[PDB]
Amino acid sequence: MQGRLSAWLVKHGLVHRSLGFDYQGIETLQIKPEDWHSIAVILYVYGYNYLRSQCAYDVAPGGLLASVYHLTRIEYGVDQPEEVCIKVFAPRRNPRIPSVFWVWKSADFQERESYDMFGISYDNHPRLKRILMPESWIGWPLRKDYIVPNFYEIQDAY
């Protein structure tokens, strides 16, 4: 079934793709990376005040890298808020996804984590650098085909 947000987007002529629902019935939409920077502003215009979480994950090793956004509304007098999951897929060879830091500031750290763990480069992020891993590290640890390069202090305590 078409979701409320998907029906609104097809009424306003915005390209997307509905991937279904999670176990709670929250809509999941797929947005092309080239249109994501324009669609995020329209998403806020719809009324999605709250960027609840930004996440990235591996669809398959040697495959696409997916960036996940969870959105909801914070308002007075609303009983059941509307929550939407939105996934943007980027190739592994050179992942490029526009940053929503200029729409929701909550992505500021989170996208950096998505850059630190999976290597998804965010364009309009002004301070895109490694946040959790050491700043001189080479490699993205959370990718499914990552291999730790045999550091001495990681090996067994002899």
Binding site: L9, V10, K11, H12, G13, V15, R17, K32
Partner: peptide
Amino acid sequence: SWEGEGENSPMEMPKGPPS
């Protein structure tokens, strides 16, 4: 596979004040 939905929907703002 499939296709990207809502490719302008071929009507969109059919009559009335456009959004």
